[PDB]
């Protein structure tokens, strides 16, 4: 047998507790990632459909097209099906691309199927998220090496919300003319007029996902929109909620994404993806990702807050997830990911420090969004770096060709380069773009909450503005932008406000002294090309 994921971290993350051994007779649901075909061909098709210089630009695959391409061989399907049925799998589901298969097993059956697996219950975080995972590595038969990439639900823990304290209520002697960031502030700064809203006359649509154990509240959105939405046409309900069953407590992150996607992309049909509630063998992100490939008609724009440390992931998992992002890019979906909230990050390895990139932010196949702030508090002038803004260089994926010029220019030109030991100059660099990330208002459980901060905020803002641009494209009879990066870099970030002041954070240590990369003229790995000036950016994304 062999371990498919020797290099997946299995360590118990902070704020989690091991509760007990799972009962042999408990049932759990494990997702099996099956061996795809024609993946190299898929990468060629993506290169073509996303390159604005190609005759094939915008000619995206249907989900049917993708499935016909990448779906596993008959041998793979038959070998895995026989293998699972034998072990006692039940109530399995697949997806249209046929490259995921999820099945219920008993804990006993599962630990026979996957020798080494030892399932325990864990709880984590302020809302007591529950999972069942193995601290021990697992093995597959050699006969499955050709057929199975990995088994979801074994190791990787879902995200839990920070216990970091926001600023307390307080007096000042300047209570401001206006505290913090609201929809009005966003739309003013990025030059959306009141006319800059969806018309509902196409079937343009957009989507956000996050993966903390929090529930979406339509009531909070309604209140948010009454508070903040007075001066632009808006919708006060989502078009669809995917993944949420039952009633439960709202949270800041689950409020932020929707409330501000629907402010930046106003009067556009919006989905929410939101799977709180018990599914202990599911990984939340993998579930979401798998399910993209199970629905043919999707929103064009998806704004996603999710990250691990890149180094924590198995090769098997990270490479497969990257292929799933490729599949989405082949279909003309624009997937945006928050760049992270720890700057360049900090990783202690081999007695030393280096930067710590995150994934999927590091995927060459997503638009990754960093964070800016204003210089003075009250006042919506020029943008600078928000110190938390995630960025840096992959240790896994090589610099994609579409950022060769931009990155080489930065590396050759930047007067503030960190020590070379701290980063991988060869790697995919991010972010690609940026928006405000400091001091948002949300409504959660019917309470307005200020000082909400992070690239989780910037990300739905940037996405909404893209979704409004798509509305223009679609009404004029053109395909949506889809995978944006090739075009954006080819166009040297035209239409974006170039962020040139400030650096993001890193190790508080004797060498880099709390700073990672610095922003500069043009593309940098703190803010990318920078922030959306709508009317200017719109002009650059109309033809082709
Ligand atoms: C995919 O979609 C079909 C509904 O069309 C459903 O029956 C199936 O269970 C879905 N797959 C998964 C893994 O959820
Ligand atoms: C907003 O969209 C709705 C359809 O959902 C449409 O009736 C309305 O005209 C739109 N408002 C504007 C200002 O385009
Ligand atoms: C540096 O990045 C490249 C990808 O461009 C990768 O192949 C290599 O493993 C990385 N180095 C380390 C030490 O991870
Ligand atoms: C919004 O437009 C004004 C010009 O009226 C410009 O000063 C500002 O930079 C624009 N916003 C962005 C983000 O470029
Ligand atoms: Ca810059």
């Amino acid at each position: 047998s062999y371990s498919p994921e020797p290099d997946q971290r299995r360590t118990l993350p902070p704020g989690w507790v091991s509760l007990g051994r799972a009962d042999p007779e408990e049932e759990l649901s494990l997702t099996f990632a099956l061996r795809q075909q024609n993946v190299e061909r898929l990468s060629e098709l993506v290169q073509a459909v996303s390159d604005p210089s190609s005759p094939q630009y915008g000619k995206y695959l249907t989900l049917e097209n993708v499935a016909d391409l990448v779906r596993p061989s008959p041998l793979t399907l038959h070998t895995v099906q026989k293998w699972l049925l034998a072990a006692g799998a039940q109530k399995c589901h697949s997806v249209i691309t046929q490259d995921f298969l999820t099945c219920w097993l008993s804990i006993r059956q599962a630990e026979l199927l996957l020798p080494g697996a030892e399932f325990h219950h864990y709880v984590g975080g302020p809302t007591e998220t529950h999972v069942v995972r193995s601290p021990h590595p697992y093995q597959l038969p050699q006969a499955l090496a050709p057929h199975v990439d990995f088994v979801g639900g074994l190791h990787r823990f879902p995200p839990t919300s920070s216990l970091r304290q926001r600023p307390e209520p307080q007096v000042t002697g300047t209570v401001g003319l206006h505290l913090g960031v609201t929809p009005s502030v966003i739309r003013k700064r990025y030059n959306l007029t009141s006319q800059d809203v969806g018309s509902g006359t196409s079937n343009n649509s957009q989507a956000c996902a996050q993966f903390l154990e929090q529930y979406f509240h339509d009531s909070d959105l309604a209140q948010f929109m009454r508070l903040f939405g007075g001066n632009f046409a808006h919708q006060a309900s989502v078009a669809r909620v995917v993944g949420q069953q039952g009633r439960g407590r709202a949270g800041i992150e689950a409020s932020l994404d929707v409330q501000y996607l629907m402010s930046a992309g106003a009067n556009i049909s919006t989905w929410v993806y939101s799977s709180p509630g018990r599914h202990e063998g599911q990984e939340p992100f993998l579930q979401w990702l798998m399910l993209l490939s199970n629905e043919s008609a999707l929103p064009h724009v998806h704004t996603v807050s999710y990250g691990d440390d890149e180094d924590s992931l198995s090769s098997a998992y990270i490479q497969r997830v990257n292929t799933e992002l490729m599949k989405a890019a082949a279909r003309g979906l624009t997937l945006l990911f928050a760049s992270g909230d720890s700057g360049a990050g900090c990783w202690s390895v081999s007695g030393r420090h280096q930067f710590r990139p995150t994934f999927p932010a590091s995927s060459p196949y997503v638009t990754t969004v960093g964070g800016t702030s204003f210089q003075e508090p009250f006042l919506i002038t020029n943008e600078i770096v928000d110190y938390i803004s995630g960025g840096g260089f992959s240790n896994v994926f090589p610099r994609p060709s579409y950022q060769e010029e931009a990155v080489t220019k930065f590396l050759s030109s930047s007067p503030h380069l960190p020590p070379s030991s701290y980063f991988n100059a060869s790697g995919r660099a991010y972010p690609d773009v940026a928006a405000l990330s400091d001091g948002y208002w949300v409504v959660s459980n019917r309470v307005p909450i200020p000082w909400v901060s992070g690239t989780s905020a910037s990300t739905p803002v940037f996405g909404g503005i893209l979704s409004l641009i798509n509305e223009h494209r679609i009404l004029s009879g053109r395909p949506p932008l889809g995978f944006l990066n090739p075009r954006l870099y080819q166009q040297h970030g035209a239409g974006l406000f170039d962020v040139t002041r400030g650096c993001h954070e890193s190790c508080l240590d004797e060498e880099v002294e709390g700073q990672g990369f610095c922003s500069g003229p043009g593309w940098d790995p703190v803010t990318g090309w920078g922030t959306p000036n709508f009317p200017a950016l719109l002009k650059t994304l109309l033809n082709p």
Side-chain angles (χ1 to χ4, degrees):
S1 65
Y2 74 90
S3 169
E5 300 185 274
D7 54 333
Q8 174 60 52
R9 184 180 295 277
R10 302 182 313 276
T11 74
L12 185 66
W16 288 84
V17 177
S18 191
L19 284 183
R21 185 84 163 86
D23 197 280
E25 303 294 346
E26 277 182 52
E27 291 285 313
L28 83 175
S29 166
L30 297 181
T31 295
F32 294 83
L34 319 182
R35 184 56 51 68
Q36 301 154 306
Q37 305 184 262
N38 292 141
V39 169
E40 151 95 301
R41 178 65 181 146
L42 175 63
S43 77
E44 299 175 354
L45 290 173
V46 176
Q47 168 61 213
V49 302
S50 63
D51 170 11
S53 298
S54 171
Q56 286 272 284
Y57 179 72
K59 307 198 172 184
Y60 304 123
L61 287 60
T62 71
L63 183 50
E64 107 205 281
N65 296 341
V66 171
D68 283 343
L69 191 59
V70 299
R71 80 158 48 93
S73 63
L75 180 55
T76 289
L77 294 174
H78 291 165
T79 305
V80 179
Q81 286 161 344
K82 285 178 201 119
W83 175 61
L84 293 169
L85 174 67
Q90 281 180 307
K91 296 165 191 169
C92 305
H93 314 108
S94 203
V95 298
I96 292 169
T97 47
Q98 286 200 304
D99 49 8
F100 291 104
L101 188 56
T102 306
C103 292
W104 290 97
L105 304 140
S106 81
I107 295 285
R108 193 197 305 290
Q109 285 167 338
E111 291 176 353
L112 286 173
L113 183 77
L114 307 171
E118 189 192 281
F119 288 99
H120 294 249
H121 302 289
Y122 306 86
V123 56
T127 69
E128 295 171 290
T129 307
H130 284 271
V131 299
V132 57
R133 295 293 190 267
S134 172
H136 296 150
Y138 71 98
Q139 299 219 92
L140 302 163
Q142 285 286 351
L144 285 161
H147 309 291
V148 177
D149 292 341
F150 63 89
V151 189
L154 261 290
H155 298 318
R156 282 174 295 276
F157 287 72
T160 62
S161 59
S162 182
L163 305 181
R164 161 191 82 88
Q165 303 293 312
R166 308 184 292 288
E168 293 279 359
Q170 78 160 275
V171 183
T172 314
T174 69
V175 254
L177 298 176
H178 182 74
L179 182 68
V181 171
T182 57
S184 278
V185 168
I186 293 310
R187 297 178 66 79
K188 177 153 201 32
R189 166 58 184 169
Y190 298 132
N191 293 319
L192 304 150
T193 78
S194 66
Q195 290 59 63
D196 280 332
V197 300
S199 75
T201 56
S202 59
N203 82 343
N204 188 41
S205 64
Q206 62 193 10
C208 54
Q210 67 84 52
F211 300 95
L212 292 172
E213 192 106 280
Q214 314 171 354
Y215 287 95
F216 161 79
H217 286 197
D218 260 324
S219 56
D220 284 340
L221 175 61
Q223 178 174 347
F224 176 103
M225 277 309 173
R226 277 170 92 193
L227 263 183
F228 289 124
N231 289 335
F232 60 91
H234 59 268
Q235 278 163 28
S237 286
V238 295
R240 182 153 173 201
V241 177
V242 179
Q244 187 166 298
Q245 282 204 326
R247 292 179 181 176
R249 188 160 184 75
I252 284 160
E253 287 83 359
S255 308
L256 175 61
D257 66 340
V258 62
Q259 274 159 25
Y260 270 100
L261 180 55
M262 294 188 67
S263 300
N267 209 39
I268 299 155
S269 265
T270 302
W271 297 14
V272 184
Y273 183 92
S274 164
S275 195
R278 292 180 184 277
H279 26 257
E280 284 190 335
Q282 301 177 355
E283 316 176 14
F285 183 75
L286 187 57
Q287 174 74 182
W288 171 79
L289 190 75
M290 162 183 74
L291 281 189
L292 291 183
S293 282
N294 202 39
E295 165 103 62
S296 178
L298 292 167
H300 304 305
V301 172
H302 301 247
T303 64
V304 191
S305 182
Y306 187 89
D308 304 283
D309 297 332
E310 186 184 67
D311 59 280
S312 78
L313 304 170
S314 66
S315 181
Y317 173 78
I318 203 173
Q319 291 296 338
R320 173 61 186 259
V321 167
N322 188 65
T323 299
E324 295 304 313
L325 303 170
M326 284 209 340
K327 289 164 55 184
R331 301 173 51 187
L333 304 174
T334 308
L335 266 46
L336 302 95
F337 275 86
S339 76
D341 290 350
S342 299
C346 192
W347 179 13
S348 285
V349 55
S350 76
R352 55 184 261 277
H353 291 158
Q354 54 196 192
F355 297 161
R356 204 176 206 157
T358 56
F359 177 92
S362 68
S363 172
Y365 278 113
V366 301
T367 299
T368 298
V369 183
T372 60
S373 48
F374 296 124
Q375 288 180 1
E376 289 90 2
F378 297 147
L379 179 69
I380 104 159
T381 222
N382 252 78
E383 284 168 276
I384 60 174
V385 169
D386 194 0
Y387 85 89
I388 55 149
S389 179
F393 291 71
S394 183
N395 287 300
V396 175
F397 307 102
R399 197 164 57 219
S401 64
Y402 64 64
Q403 73 172 5
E404 171 64 19
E405 183 179 296
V407 170
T408 297
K409 177 149 158 175
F410 170 78
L411 290 175
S412 65
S413 77
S414 175
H416 302 311
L417 263 196
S420 63
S421 63
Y422 276 77
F423 69 102
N424 191 333
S426 81
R428 193 279 213 251
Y430 61 98
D432 309 294
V433 304
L436 284 163
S437 64
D438 193 354
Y440 281 66
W441 290 84
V442 306
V443 178
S444 174
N445 303 298
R446 292 193 165 85
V447 175
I449 301 182
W451 309 132
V452 174
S453 282
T455 48
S456 287
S458 55
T459 292
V461 167
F462 206 105
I465 287 159
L466 291 182
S467 180
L468 182 54
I469 292 170
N470 270 341
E471 179 118 351
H472 283 258
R473 292 180 57 75
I474 292 160
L475 280 170
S476 73
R478 293 180 179 337
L481 293 161
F483 172 40
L484 178 64
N485 279 12
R487 176 156 192 180
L488 185 68
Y489 281 78
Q490 279 187 31
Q491 297 180 176
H492 305 89
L496 304 174
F497 174 87
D498 182 8
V499 181
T500 65
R501 285 311 189 183
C503 315
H504 64 179
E505 59 169 354
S506 184
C507 307
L508 294 176
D509 77 14
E510 53 201 1
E511 191 152 351
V512 291
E513 301 194 349
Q515 302 218 117
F517 299 98
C518 294
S519 71
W523 179 98
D524 52 73
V526 183
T527 56
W529 293 107
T531 79
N533 181 22
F534 164 74
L537 183 63
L538 169 67
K539 285 187 205 195
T540 79
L541 291 173
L542 281 179
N543 178 50

